[PDB]
Structure formats: structure tokens, C-alpha cells
Design a protein around this ligand. Structure first.
Ligand SMILES: Nc1ncnc2c1ncn2[C@@H]1O[C@H](CO)[C@@H](O)[C@H]1O
Ligand SMILES: Nc1ncnc2c1ncn2[C@@H]1O[C@H](CO)[C@@H](O)[C@H]1O
Ligand SMILES: [Ca+2]
Ligand SMILES: [Ca+2]
Lengths: 364, 366
């Protein structure tokens, strides 16, 4: 409704947004069954992509959570996007509900959007992933440059759920769209569980993130399970980020590791002791080395745009959200057909804490 | 300190009136406008709160940065802080928070001879109480094999904020024969000083001691503390059951202590800390899961002794009022020799509910 708007406005939740010629309202936060990242435009609403619960125990989780067989899809380690067509143009929305200047700039490189020309009702939900994205430092192990897009669900304008698995696969085959791997359809029987475990071991051995389970049912329930490798890397990856993150971030990922060790047994999981230790220590050691050398703690990011304008709009966008973290452009040079952007995320508080500690300071 | 500072903190809820052992008093629940937490205002005097000691993370550069004069090095004993004083013909013991501790107050006559207060009624004795049978802390120093023991490390004075000097302190302890924290000696941040202090921490660490407190031999009498990696590790482990009640920097903070020691000492010779840091998190939590599977609750058991039954009951009632989300649950209150033996559980309800939710295949949104 519009009174829903009123309440969400006055109490911050929703915000007006001005970008790409457009004016619209964006729920910066989840509120009374309207999900985060729902975006109210003039002609329509692109609903927020709902949260997928995590299970920590594979067997007991699959058994408790699901009422029917379920599809097992790869969880690709990138960032969520929802793509749609508005007028004769195409827009990519981040999870937070902003129009992504990188993704939108790059759509024609990443995906054939004929599907939207012929089906303008659809919202394509896709993971964008690769070593040269502006949001995350990790990449799937099979993407070694630039970024790739992987469709994983279809939604519709002004509609909250998802096209059945079979309609999703129908549109992916018909329009030859790039997509997340379908591992198959399983159940939580002893035979299903054993095969899913075999998948997760392979995923772990190859550095893949995990899987998303999708119920073959009207309700179409989802859940995700993440490998120990990915949970470890999240710890490591976030060393420089420690002051910005709730403690919960870490005790949640510790629990994930510990519950896997409980599920599979200590004998087969001893190695995680050292590796958990290295996930914390090695990233922090790397933060200290960097501070000795550069007097700054930061991550460097690199990525490519068709248009100079969009690289600048990305630096702007990262700047509005991020705080105590300086987004500092390093380079923007035309390299062939693209503009190559290099920028640093500077962690000002970690920078001040390490310099204070290293110089012999006191902390309470 | 004055009347309208106290009036505003009663309104802002930094101070609260308590009553205990026949005494009615005002208690500083938090820091407020430089009045340290634990400050207790009695009608006849103020017992100032024990002030915060800062932590250095780099032993050599910290000592060199923080101190301008020589400094005494004392053992940091891992127990709980107590402030002990005379009122009328009675003696009382305050927790760091400023409550009159029914356990510590009950056991004063077994813990320490208080002739010193009789002869010097202005003194406040600052001591650590430590041992395996105390109600605040599961951990024990290794050299207290049972019950509890008390170790003086400072004197304060009624109505005053500072500390008796080292000399003055060492004289009172020698005169009245008080139990005291080990004194390592008087040092400077020179090359030689630093070599000796590092040998001391290496030894303590190998002996499982907590660390040391450094105390400037001067008027400003600046203090600083440094913790062994062993104690830092053990804190992470013994706090597993406690993880949902974690302040906004247990991670960044206890890990940085270990990481900066590794950096100071070299990462070649400190590699075993990887596995040890992993074990600290993983084995504490694994044990809380084993305990949950066995007893269907996640809890720590505490055991301690009183001269008076009313005091054990008063202790239970004190612990229920702090601890929310933590259930205090008596197991045993029984005569044992000339003492009432108390055993009780702190049940962590949130850890208990979370592990139950996850272990039966629950979903967590985040
Ligand atoms: N196959 C997949 N199905 C659903 N979500 C996925 C998949 N791969 C990666 N993801 C990401 O995981 C997140 C879980 O909410 C989604 O926002 C999405 O961006
Ligand atoms: N020798 C010592 N000097 C000062 N504080 C000590 C000592 N040993 C243990 N402690 C405890 O360590 C805490 C440091 O904040 C103090 O509140 C005190 O309870
Ligand atoms: Ca990851
Ligand atoms: Ca300890």
C-alpha cells in the first residue's frame, strides 16, 4: 500500500533513489513481509529476492526442512543480481536494491537479453562472479578472468515467488542462457544423503562454495548448505574487515565448521583445527605486513566497463554504503574496448588500530 | 564527586542504591564522567572503584612507549577482583561491580588476617581471589589446588582515588604478613630489562600463568598489563558456552593479542599457535555439543564453601540478578565439616536453545 510507504519512510526503512535517469523507492531494510531490496518504480515493483535459510547439519537438515524431493543447484560465490527491462533499456539491481552501475553497464557482455524483449514480465535472478568484480574479492575456481553471470531463478514483475524448476529450465534451454549447475533431483533418504555428501566432498576438494536445495512443491522451500572450505575462506577473507563486522559473523561461521565436524566425526576432520587457526591468523598477519609497508590497510579491486560514466557511478555507490572504509580510485584508463578501473577499499579503523598497537599503544 | 553528579546518574541509571549485610549504599553500575564503575558510596565514606588497566599487545615497544620511569613487574593472577574494608567492627568485600560479595565477605577470616584494617581503618585492600572452588570463574591458577586463596596487589584509601606507592605497599604486606601477588622486581625498558622481562613471560607462559601487571614507580603511577598466549587461548576455550553473550570485539581483540605476539616473536617459531587457536574455538564448542547431547542443557557447574548458610543463599540470589539469559540453578547445599558446601549451575539458555535448533536440523537466516 501507500501507508506502508509512509511508515517505512518516516522510520528510515524505505528511501527514494535517483539513478540512471530514474526515480524510485528502495527498501534499504526488511520490513513486515516486504523483503529488503524490493524496488518500487513508477510502472512496477521488482520484489526483493527472499532470504534462503542455512542448515548446519546436512542429514538432519534435509530431513527436517523438506517435504518432497528437491533440486540440488551449485551455489556460486559472487553477488546476487536481478535484471529487468524498463522501456527500451535494461537494469541490474543489487540485493540491496540499488541499480548496479557495473552489472548494468556490462549486461550485453554477460547475457543475451532477448528473453526480456520477448518476455518483459520476467526478472532474471543471477549470480555474477569472477576475479574482477567490484564487490567481493573471491572468485569461483573455474572463472579466471573478468566476470561471468549464472542464472539461478526467474521472478516476475509485481510477483513474489519463482517459476517452477521446470519452467526455469524451459526458459534456460530455449534461450541458451548461462546458469548454475543442476546436480539433480534428490531426497533425504539414505541413498540421497550419501550422494549429496559425495557432491559436497568434491565441491570442497575443488574450492566450490556449496549448494542450494529447492523443493519440488507449490511452496518451493529453499535452503543452502556451505562447504567448510568456503566458511574458512570467509573468515580469512574478512581479516582486514574485523572491526566492521559483528562478533556474530565469526561465531556463526565457527559453529558451521564445528557442526560439520560433529556431523562427519573428528577423525575425518582434524585438519580443520590448523586451518581455522590459519584463517584468522594469516589474514591478520597479512594486514600487519601491509601496514608496515604502506601505512594503510586495504584491498585492491579491479574491473572493466563499457563506459567511463559507469565506472564513476560505481565508485560513488560503493562510497555511499561503505563507512569508515575509504573507496579510493587508483586508475581509470581506456584499455582496448573497455575502461579499466582499479580502486582500493581502505579500512581506516583497522589502519588506526594496527598503527596504534604496533607503536606500543594501550587499549582497554 | 558531588550531589548533582550522583543525582544525574540516578536519573541516567549509572548509579543504584543497594542494600546488603545491613548496609544501604549507592553503587556505580557503569563508568560515569570519570567515576569508575564499582564505586560505592557509603554514608561515612566512599570506596572508589578499581580503575581500568590498559593492555599492551607488543611487549618491547609497549614498555618502551608507555613508561618514563622504572617499573615494578607483578604477577597477574587469574581470579576475581576484590576490595576489602572495615566499617564499624565488621569487614566487607566488594566485587568489581561494587556489590558486597556474600561469598568473599563470608570467607574473609579464612582468606586474610584483617588486623591491618583494625590498625589502619582508612585502608582498602585490593586483592585477587582465586581457586578452583569459587563461584565466579571456572578457571584456577595452577598453584591453588583447592578452595580459594587471596592475593593482595594494591591498597587504596577510603575517599581517595589513587594507590599507595610500591614501597608503602611492600611495607604493609611485610608488616602484617599478607598473602601477595609474586613480585618479579623493578625494571627499565632497556635492552637488559627487556631481555629479562621476556624471559619472565616465556616462563610464565610455559607455567600456565596469566601474565603480569607493570606499575610505574612514580607519582602518576601508570599501569599496564600483558597476557600470555596460553591464557589468551584458554580464555577463548573456556568461553565457548558463553559465545552468544560476546562483546563487540572479543574476536578482533583476543586474536590480535595472539597475532601480535606471533609477530613480535616471529612466525617461524610460533607456528603451533595455528592448531592451538583452532582447538581453542573448536574443542570448547565440541564439548558444549557433547554436553548438550548428554544432558540436554548447556551449563557450567560451580562449587564453593561457606561458613554461613544465609551467605550461600545470598550468593545464589546475587547471581540471578546479574546473569540474565543465564539461569542460576542450585544443585547441592549441604553441611560439610564446619562449612556449608554449595554447588550450582549456570545454564546458558540461548546456547542451549541454539544448539537444540541446529542439531535437530533447524534453519538459520543469516
Ligand atoms: N544456485 C543458486 N540458487 C540460489 N542462490 C544462489 C545460487 N548460487 C548463488 N546464489 C546466491 O546465494 C544467495 C542466498 O540467498 C543468493 O542471494 C544468491 O545471490
Ligand atoms: N598483580 C596485579 N595487579 C593489579 N591487578 C591484578 C593483579 N593480579 C590480578 N589482577 C586483576 O587483573 C585485573 C586487571 O584489570 C584487575 O582488576 C585485578 O582484579
Ligand atoms: Ca566465500
Ligand atoms: Ca584466563
Amino acid at each position: 500500500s501507500p501507508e506502508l510507504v509512509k511508515e517505512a519512510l518516516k522510520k528510515k526503512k524505505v528511501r527514494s533513489e535517483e539513478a540512471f535517469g530514474l526515480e524510485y523507492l528502495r527498501f534499504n531494510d526488511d520490513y513486515k513481509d516486504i523483503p529488503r531490496g524490493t524496488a518500487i518504480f513508477k510502472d512496477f515493483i521488482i520484489w526483493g529476492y527472499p532470504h534462503i535459510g542455512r542448515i548446519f547439519l546436512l542429514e538432519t537438515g534435509l530431513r527436517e526442512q523438506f517435504e518432497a524431493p528437491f533440486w540440488v543447484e551449485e551455489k556460486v560465490d559472487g553477488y546476487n543480481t536481478r535484471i529487468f527491462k524498463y522501456g527500451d533499456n535494461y537494469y541490474a539491481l543489487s540485493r540491496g536494491g540499488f541499480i548496479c552501475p557495473f552489472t548494468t553497464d556490462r549486461l550485453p557482455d554477460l547475457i543475451d537479453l532477448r528473453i526480456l524483449d520477448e518476455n518483459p514480465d520476467l526478472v532474471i535472478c543471477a549470480e555474477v562472479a569472477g576475479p574482477e568484480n567490484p564487490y567481493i574479492e573471491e572468485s569461483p575456481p573455474y572463472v579466471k578472468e573478468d566476470v561471468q553471470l549464472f542464472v539461478f531463478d526467474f521472478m516476475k514483475k509485481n510477483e513474489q515467488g519463482f517459476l517452477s524448476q521446470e519452467e526455469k529450465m524451459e526458459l534456460i534451454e530455449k534461450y541458451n542462457l548461462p546458469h548454475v549447475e543442476i546436480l539433480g533431483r534428490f531426497t533425504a533418504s539414505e541413498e540421497g544423503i550419501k550422494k549429496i555428501k559425495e557432491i559436497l566432498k568434491r565441491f570442497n576438494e575443488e574450492g566450490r562454495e556449496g549448494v542450494v536445495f529447492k523443493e519440488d512443491s507449490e511452496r518451493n522451500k529453499r535452503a543452502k548448505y556451505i562447504t567448510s572450505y568456503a566458511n574458512l575462506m570467509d573468515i580469512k577473507t574478512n581479516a582486514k574487515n574485523m572491526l566492521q563486522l559483528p562478533p556474530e559473523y565469526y561465531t556463526n561461521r565457527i559453529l558451521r565448521l564445528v557442526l560439520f565436524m560433529y556431523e562427519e566425526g573428528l577423525k575425518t576432520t582434524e585438519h580443520l583445527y590448523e586451518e581455522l587457526g590459519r584463517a584468522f591468523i594469516d589474514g591478520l598477519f597479512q594486514a600487519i605486513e601491509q601496514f608496515e609497508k604502506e601505512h594503510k590497510v586495504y584491498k585492491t579491486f579491479t574491473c572493466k566497463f563499457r563506459k567511463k560514466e559507469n565506472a564513476i557511478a560505481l565508485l560513488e555507490l560503493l562510497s555511499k554504503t561503505s563507512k569508515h572504509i575509504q573507496v579510493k580510485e587508483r586508475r581509470l584508463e581506456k584499455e582496448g574496448d573497455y575502461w579499466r578501473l582499479e580502486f582500493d577499499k581502505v579500512f581506516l579503523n583497522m589502519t588506526g588500530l594496527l598503527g596504534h598497537l604496533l607503536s606500543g599503544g594501550i587499549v582497554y
